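Input record, target 12 of the design panel.
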């Protein structure tokens, strides 16, 4: 069936809010991305950096991640550039393996269900790192695939993703990077069934009817996912119920839980 994939800006929003939405006695959301841990170049090293918000969530996996997983939601660690000049796309071979290993170790250590790649904000070329692509982004996907074959990889369709066609068998879903209007196409050779061509911004939300009509079109054309970006702690059930009607011939309800972020 169609998968609902939501990115939570964990600098702002407690991720438990994704579990407050119910459709058919199950969570409306199928995948939650904790957006985001960072790739950072530190000298010759490619490093995985968790900011204080991300690290807090990982340190509290049993109370901020596991409650979602216990409901059946798959929780992914988002991966994002962070202004160092090193990103997913300009690593050498050693750096690629180093970063793949750091990511796999975090997925294992924190009991996560996989990762999402958003090749954004790396600022390619700073600090003496290569200004252009080395082809590492495909090699990074392959390396993670081999390390965690049973875990999910999603790709937010931004940055050097045009390079990923050859490794797209290792990517579960790609997600359109612009909001509130479909683009009836996919990135990096993905089939309809592995792509979200429509991504709703849940902060600057469209009308429920807009979501209902577009999500009905997504379903009719056989796409495999709908994207959601920036779920907040307000009750946005009207929009999700629109999708429940349009794409799932169902309804979405809210359990009342607005979880604050006080860490
Ligand atoms: Mg509105």
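The sequence produced for target 12 reads:
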């Amino acid at each position: 069936g169609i998968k609902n994939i939501v990115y939570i800006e964990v600098n702002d929003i407690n991720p438990l809010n994704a579990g407050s939405y119910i459709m058919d006695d199950a969570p409306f959301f199928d995948y939650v991305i904790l957006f985001a841990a960072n790739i950072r170049g530190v000298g010759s090293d490619a490093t995985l950096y968790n900011n204080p918000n991300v690290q807090y969530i990982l340190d509290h996996k049993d109370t901020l991640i596991k409650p979602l997983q216990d409901k059946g939601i798959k929780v992914l660690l988002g991966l994002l550039g962070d202004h160092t000049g090193l990103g997913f796309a300009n690593m050498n071979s050693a750096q690629t393996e180093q970063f793949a290993t750091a990511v796999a170790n975090a997925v294992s250590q924190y009991g996560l269900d996989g990762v999402d790649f958003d090749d954004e904000w790396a600022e390619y070329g700073r600090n003496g790192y290569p200004s252009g692509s080395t082809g590492s982004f495909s090699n990074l996907i392959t390396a993670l695939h081999n390390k965690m074959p049973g875990k999910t990889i999603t790709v937010f369709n931004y940055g050097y993703t045009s390079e990923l066609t050859g490794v797209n068998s290792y990517i579960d879903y790609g997600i359109y990077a612009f909001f509130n209007s479909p683009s009836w196409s996919t990135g990096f050779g993905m089939p309809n069934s592995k792509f979200a061509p429509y991504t709703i911004n849940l902060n600057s939300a469209p009308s429920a009817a807009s979501a209902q009509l577009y999500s009905g079109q997504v379903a009719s054309k056989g796409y495999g996912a709908i994207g959601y970006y920036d779920l907040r702690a307000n009750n946005i059930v009207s929009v999700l119920n629109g999708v429940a009607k349009g794409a799932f011939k169902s309804t979405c309800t809210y359990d009342g839980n607005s979880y604050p972020k006080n860490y």
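The pocket of magnesium ion is lined by residues 205, 207 (CB under 6 Å).
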